Design a protein around this ligand. Structure first.
Ligand SMILES: COCC[C@@]1(C(=O)Nc2cncc3ccccc23)CCNc2ccc(Cl)cc21
Lengths: 297, 300
């Protein structure tokens, strides 16, 4: 029993964190094999700023060891610093681009030193509600699938509302953001519906059934109600993905949707679900299955 | 900006997790140098659990009865001793991944990270607090016993908890790394119930200061309170008594925000009275009590 916001073990990622300094700017880098990946704004027309830099302008520190940069190239908004030493702690890894609603762990770092790990989701507006201070740029987001680390995010900036923006490890931003000091605002956010349903199933698995009802709904009627409450449209794929949870609890996805529809139109009425007075949307259906089954890495 | 429940990076702890098997029971162990620490109930059957005589069960065991697996390598047990509710298995290999560590016993209200493990393999990391009733509201399934709680401060891992059991209410009980249980619990299948839980007041105040630091002042008021009057109100909401030590510990946050601890106590009193009225504080519709004053200073 128990349901917590759980992050993946950060060990395979900690062994990759390095400190990158370029002039006055100091941020974090991801050292995988002989390449250190970091936000290209460490050089701060990026092509023009980068061509004026030489390898020895980039100081890379892996713990108490200085790595010597032997090359540099830019891929989108990520700078790839070729180093002389291959990281012996390089895990089995992939660079994956995630979709809004998908969750991941963030190993927040300052000066190439990991300080904390937390779990979060890519919001439908492509921002992440992270916890980042100055110096955290280059901190990465990841998932683990067996022994393989799937790097999915690299922190680049904080928006004026306190939310965060970043890229995949190929340097492509999530959302309509640019790595430039300019007027940028997060779009209106929506609740990740499939995740709220998954979290309601996690509540049922943990013995919290007060919100269940005898009603069901059509998928179209649910989406008409959901659109009004700034909830993401629930697709047939979302219904299919919730299938295993529906089978485990004996509650049809559209039956759980009628419970969610009632929670949206009526509130919780002084009650909580899994110790929460708000509907949680940062657990995917897979996170619920992985946690209420004990999958290991 | 942003405020999240943040666990410590689990790497230094992952390199210590091992699987311990004794007969049919399989749980986790903490391999530090040449000793593997694990709950002593690894030697118990489900029948033994009612009234186990651990001294009697342990004297019937030999080193080779304990199978210890570190990844895909079997460790040879060369000795065994019991310290309170922890079994200490002497092994023939010192863990090369042993970090700088301490065994610390924490007090209620203190927070820590839990690296939940199954079969000596880490599956997830989460942050939590030692409740005033000495339980932890963890997320543990069968096989998670021996998973540990820790804090990491300046390259040193402070092991503070080892998971032993789940109470009938779904909350968890365990020991420090010297095998002393937190709370009035025993490693016995007997009628054990968690005491009435209370909110960690000093932590809610710290989290209200974190909200002020992040630009949220809606809950503040023109009032102050006496410490005694605050405690009289707090007791009625099942909030832990706030002591002068708690007031002293909140001092740096009070100086950083310019809000006296007793003025913040007055906002808390008003929040308990009024509720949040559709508003949130740091994205929460409830008053958060699992961030200590030290965690707030750390994260901000
Ligand atoms: C022989 O070992 C028994 C373990 C056991 C226990 O609580 N295990 C678990 C611990 N944590 C999360 C659990 C989630 C679901 C189910 C079991 C879980 C089983 C129950 N009676 C008991 C009594 C005293 C003590 Cl100290 C341990 C236990």
């Amino acid at each position: 029993s128990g349901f917590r916001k759980m992050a993946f073990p950060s060990g395979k990622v900690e062994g990759c964190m390095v400190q990158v300094t370029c002039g006055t700017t100091t941020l974090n880098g991801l050292w995988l094999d002989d390449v250190v990946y970091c936000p290209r704004h460490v050089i701060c027309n990026y092509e023009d700023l980068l061509i004026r830099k030489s390898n020895h302008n980039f100081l890379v520190q892996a713990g108490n060891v200085q790595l010597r940069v032997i090359g540099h190239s830019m891929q989108n908004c990520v700078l790839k610093l070729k180093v002389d030493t291959a990281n012996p702690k390089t895990p089995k890894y992939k660079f994956v681009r995630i979709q809004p609603g998908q969750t991941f762990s963030v190993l927040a770092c300052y000066n190439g030193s990991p300080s904390g790990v937390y779990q979060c989701a890519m919001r439908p507006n492509f921002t992440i509600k992270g916890s980042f201070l100055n110096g955290s740029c280059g901190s990465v987001g990841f998932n683990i699938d067996y022994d393989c680390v799937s790097f999915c995010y690299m922190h680049h900036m904080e928006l004026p509302t306190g939310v965060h923006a970043g890229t995949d490890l190929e340097g492509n931003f999530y959302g309509p953001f640019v790595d430039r000091q300019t007027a940028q605002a997060a779009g209106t956010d929506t609740t990740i519906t499939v995740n709220v349903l998954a979290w309601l199933y996690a509540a049922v698995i943990n013995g919290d059934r007060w919100f269940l009802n005898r009603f069901t709904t059509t998928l179209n009627d649910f989406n008409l109600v959901a659109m009004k409450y700034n909830y993401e449209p629930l697709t047939q794929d979302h219904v299919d993905i919730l299938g295993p949870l529906s089978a485990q609890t004996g509650i049809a996805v559209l039956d759980m949707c009628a419970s969610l529809k009632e929670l949206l139109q009526n509130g919780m009425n002084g009650r909580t679900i899994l110790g929460s007075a708000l509907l949680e949307d940062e657990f995917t259906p897979f996170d619920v299955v992985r946690q209420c089954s004990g999958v290991t890495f």
